[PDB]
Amino acid sequence: LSLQIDAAKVEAQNQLNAARIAEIFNNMDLSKQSEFREFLKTVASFQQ
Amino acid sequence: LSLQIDAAKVEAQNQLNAARIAEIFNNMDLSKQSEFREFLKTVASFQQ
């Protein structure tokens, strides 16, 4: 009972970690570069 | 039982901390610089 329960929720946490962690690195870095293209967008409006 | 349960939820909280903390630093700083590009946007409307 506790064996397959705990192993099951262990793998559940495993998809939780792959999911959340990937969301972290991706969303953080890519949103940072979105702020980058946005800075360059405002500079583009300046050149306009 | 309590061993793999508590270790399991410890790593669960670990992804919770990486997730939420990264959300903090990123969203705060990047949204701050969004207020920056927004100030410069209003100044751009002034120059217009």
Curated annotation (Swiss-Prot), chains A, B:
Belongs to the p22likevirus portal protein family. This is Portal protein. Homododecamer. Interacts with the terminase large subunit; this interaction allows the packaging of viral DNA. Interacts (via C-terminus) with the head-to-tail adapter protein gp4; this interaction participates in the head completion. Interacts with the scaffolding protein; this interaction initiates procapsid assembly, thereby ensuring incorporation of only one portal ring per capsid. Interacts with the capsid protein. It comes from the Viruses. The lineage of its organism: Viruses, Duplodnaviria, Heunggongvirae, Uroviricota, Caudoviricetes. Coiled coil: none annotated. It comes from Salmonella phage P22 (Bacteriophage P22). Forms the portal vertex of the capsid. This portal plays critical roles in head assembly, genome packaging, neck/tail attachment, and genome ejection. Procapsid assembly may initiate with a nucleation complex composed of portal and scaffolding proteins. The portal protein multimerizes as a single ring-shaped homododecamer arranged around a central channel. Switches upon genome packaging from an asymmetrical conformation in the procapsid (PC-portal) to a symmetrical ring in the mature capsid (MV-portal). This change of conformation may serve as a signal for headful packaging. It is found in: Virion.
